[PDB]
């Protein structure tokens, strides 16, 4: 059976391109009778995000070639913090204990500001301590991931979890994302204003969940890549954007 | 000053050198995106030509005002078969003031542009082709005619209010409006679908009941230039000069 790439980015004030502020993204993976379903998601979920209303927005098909993997989703556990800054610390031990150096966490909060606007991911080299991707504003996407809700719906029940997407969204890319042997770990809270958890993932403490990560209304979002490993950064990217990925939970 | 956005689609399969199957242009309020998405959607989904592999659909704010004009008068030339309508064609396109060799010329050149998927633009001065688009073509864009005047102009014109019909007719009264364009001429890519046009200022827009046999995707966009202007100028406008059709029943 055939699979199809969905995407979407949308923004305000001009394309992404232009210098406007990014709004919403999606990225999906499904049979081609989903289609019209997909599509028009996608399309809601740009028209009705808390960072505002775009003006510019794309939505793409394409079919996959690739084969699919099914894999299962990482362990989740749920770190209660008090506040932000106790969520930032956490999330810094716990980068540290999935093999992050120190000094490496330290250099990536210098420019973790600066990286508010980004519209996909960073990747941050281990072996340089500075920035491996050169796609500057842009990030990097990852996609052609996706989660059926039925199987997610019954992994959130079991795991005492609200069944949101955007909880389903965050943990099929952690998922994905931790699986490619060059990523040590990923660090991540939302750039949505109404939305303060994020988590901390990787390999040995799987999804790290960390219940307050910023203050509400805040719009500065963080989503970086710790990368050790072997190959050229275009490599990676290519991986990240064309690996085809379906999670599937089982007990 | 109501706000007004481009909505656009591409379609095509075997790839992004694949083949063209469906474009669309909209213009449209902020109001019906839902449904403008969608039939752009079901339009790319369903054509004759095949199903696509691949599609882009796009929307963002124009910011020029937005200009308003009456549909070009119609007549329909029935025709009782493709050679027929053909001699027509070029009859009435000579008395419309492209001359004879040049009609020629471009007719020889036709079946080479029948995989361009914008139109194609034709110099009367150099007996050449003007742009430098190649297979992409000059894809004219945010012109509309809102649906319920273009219902009204139809059951008026005795003309059957099909969206094929809205739409040639759209584009050929945004391009014949143009000061360096002559003529126009049209027939369908689509195998199911042989009736085709000539456009221009003084004859209007004159409908050409067979202009190839059914079952043919071999089509045909060209506009006759008149100009001393850089191309790119015309090309400008044809892609971003924003036009609604409104037909004006009082008169
Ligand atoms: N597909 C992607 N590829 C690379 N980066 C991405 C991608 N999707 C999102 N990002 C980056 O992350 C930033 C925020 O993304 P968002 O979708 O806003 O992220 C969230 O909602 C994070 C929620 C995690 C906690 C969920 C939970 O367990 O309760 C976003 O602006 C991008 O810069
Ligand atoms: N927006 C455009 N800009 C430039 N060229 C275009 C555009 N739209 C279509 N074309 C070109 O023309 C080709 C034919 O497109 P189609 O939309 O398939 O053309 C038609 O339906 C023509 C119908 C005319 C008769 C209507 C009537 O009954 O009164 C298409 O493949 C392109 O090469
Ligand atoms: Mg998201
Ligand atoms: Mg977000
Ligand atoms: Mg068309
Ligand atoms: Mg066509």
Redesign the pocket.
């Given at each position: 059976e055939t699979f199809y790439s969905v995407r979407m980015r949308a923004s305000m004030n001009g394309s992404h391109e232009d210098g406007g502020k990014?709004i919403s993204?999606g990225?999906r993976l499904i049979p081609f009778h989903e289609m019209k379903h997909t599509v028009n998601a996608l399309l809601e979920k740009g028209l009705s995000h808390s960072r505002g209303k775009p003006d510019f927005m794309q939505i793409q098909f394409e079919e996959v070639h690739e084969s699919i993997k099914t894999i299962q989703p990482l362990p989740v556990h749920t770190n209660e913090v008090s506040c932000p800054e106790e969520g930032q610390k956490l999330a810094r031990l716990l980068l540290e204990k999935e093999g992050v150096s120190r000094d490496v966490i330290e250099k990536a909060y210098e420019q973790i500001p600066e990286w508010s606007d980004?519209?996909?991911?960073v990747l941050f080299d281990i072996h340089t301590g500075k920035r491996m991707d050169q796609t500057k504003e842009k990030?990097?996407?990852?996609?052609r991931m996706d989660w059926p809700d039925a199987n997610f719906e019954k992994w959130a029940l079991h795991s005492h979890?609200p069944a949101?997407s955007?909880?389903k969204?965050?943990?099929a890319?952690a998922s994905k994302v931790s699986r490619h042997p060059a990523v040590v770990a990923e660090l991540?809270?939302?750039?949505?204003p109404d939305?303060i958890?994020?988590?901390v993932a990787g390999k040995k403490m799987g999804?790290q969940?960390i219940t307050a990560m910023k203050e509400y209304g805040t719009e500065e979002?963080?989503?970086v890549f710790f990368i050790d490993g072997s190959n050229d950064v275009n490599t990676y990217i290519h991986d990240?954007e064309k690996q085809p990925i379906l999670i599937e939970w089982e007990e």
């Amino acid at each position: 059976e055939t699979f199809y790439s969905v995407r979407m980015r949308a923004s305000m004030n001009g394309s992404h391109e232009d210098g406007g502020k990014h709004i919403s993204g999606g990225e999906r993976l499904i049979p081609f009778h989903e289609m019209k379903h997909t599509v028009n998601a996608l399309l809601e979920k740009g028209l009705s995000h808390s960072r505002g209303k775009p003006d510019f927005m794309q939505i793409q098909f394409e079919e996959v070639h690739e084969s699919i993997k099914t894999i299962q989703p990482l362990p989740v556990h749920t770190n209660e913090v008090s506040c932000p800054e106790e969520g930032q610390k956490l999330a810094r031990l716990l980068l540290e204990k999935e093999g992050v150096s120190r000094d490496v966490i330290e250099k990536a909060y210098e420019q973790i500001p600066e990286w508010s606007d980004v519209r996909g991911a960073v990747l941050f080299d281990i072996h340089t301590g500075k920035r491996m991707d050169q796609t500057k504003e842009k990030g990097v996407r990852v996609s052609r991931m996706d989660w059926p809700d039925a199987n997610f719906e019954k992994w959130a029940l079991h795991s005492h979890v609200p069944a949101h997407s955007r909880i389903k969204e965050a943990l099929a890319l952690a998922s994905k994302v931790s699986r490619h042997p060059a990523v040590v770990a990923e660090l991540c809270w939302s750039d949505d204003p109404d939305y303060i958890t994020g988590y901390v993932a990787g390999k040995k403490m799987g999804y790290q969940r960390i219940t307050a990560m910023k203050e509400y209304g805040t719009e500065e979002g963080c989503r970086v890549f710790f990368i050790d490993g072997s190959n050229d950064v275009n490599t990676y990217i290519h991986d990240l954007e064309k690996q085809p990925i379906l999670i599937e939970w089982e007990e």
